[PDB]
Design a protein around this ligand. Structure first.
Ligand SMILES: N#Cc1cnc(NC(=O)Nc2cc3ccccc3cn2)cn1
Length: 270
């Protein structure tokens, strides 16, 4: 009934690869992210996005089609990507990484609970709102791995090589959930060391061979404290059947270690 409420001005480019624009409502000044896709690929991304509703998953508000162009109305996260909070070769303070890792697990538990695998978890796909709350973004490579309580094994090779689990390079078929668990472990490694451990997880990769031989005196492992390193030892396990599951990540000692204070709240003295 209110005129002009459906009008959004595109005020700035947020990302590319089509593009993601910052859209501001003409009347309310509400900020959303509009993903512009110049076209089955986007049809599956829209259908998976309509299933999503969680505080650590980028919100989907709706979609509009202007002939050949698809417009996806998605949550605006003013904090940007987790990628730009990682200082090269340093990482970030361990309590900040623990808090981001808690929020990443909550989002992944949610997705896996409704039978969705993201398949491309990496810091470029983890967005931060104004309060630094993590949001899993971009369901362009996501798929349903469980339907009618029946698990379907995956075979499609996808994701990003430094974050992919070794079974995707070695086996024809693999379970979906240990693959996302592995990529979260590489995110945790990146957050605590500011560097990726290997180009890809194969025996032909020397840094990967060094990890399987427990050469933790080498980088990036030498920069990581023993408590989060003991967790990484459980996540970055070559055999996906022996790899730690999320319920067991939730019982890990470092995972449950008190490290971070709540957000700074205004206070006065006397
Ligand atoms: N796919 C997808 C997607 C991409 N971006 C979404 N939302 C954002 O607010 N993105 C965003 C916000 C940024 C804010 C500051 C700097 C860089 C930024 C990069 N990207 C939502 N979904």
């Amino acid at each position: 009934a209110v005129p002009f409420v459906e009008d959004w001005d595109l005020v700035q480019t947020l990302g590319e690869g089509g593009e993601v624009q910052l859209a501001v409502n003409r009347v309310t000044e509400e900020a959303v992210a509009v993903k512009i896709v110049d076209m089955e690929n986007i049809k599956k991304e829209i259908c998976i996005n309509k299933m999503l509703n969680h505080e650590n998953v980028v919100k989907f508000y709706g979609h509009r089609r202007e002939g050949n162009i698809q417009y996806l109305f998605l949550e605006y996260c003013s904090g940007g990507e987790l990628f730009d909070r990682i200082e090269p070769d340093i990482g970030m303070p361990e309590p900040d990484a623990q808090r981001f890792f808690h929020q990443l697990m909550a989002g992944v538990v949610y997705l896996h609970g409704i039978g969705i695998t993201h398949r491309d978890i990496k810091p470029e796909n983890l967005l931060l709102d104004e309060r630094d709350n993590l949001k899993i973004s971009d369901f362009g490579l996501a798929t349903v791995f469980r339907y009618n309580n029946r698990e379907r094994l995956l075979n499609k090779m996808c994701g990003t090589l430094p974050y992919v689990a070794p079974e995707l390079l070695k086996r024809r078929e693999f379970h979906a959930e240990p693959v996302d668990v592995w990529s979260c472990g590489i995110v945790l490694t990146a957050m605590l060391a500011g560097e990726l451990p290997w180009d890809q997880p194969s025996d032909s990769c020397q840094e990967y061979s060094d990890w399987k031989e427990k050469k933790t005196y080498l980088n990036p492992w030498k920069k990581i404290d023993s408590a989060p390193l003991a967790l990484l030892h459980k996540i970055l396990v070559e055999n996906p059947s022996a790899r730690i599951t999320i319920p067991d990540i939730k019982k890990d000692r470092w995972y449950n270690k008190p490290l971070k204070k709540g957000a700074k709240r205004p206070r006065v003295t006397s």
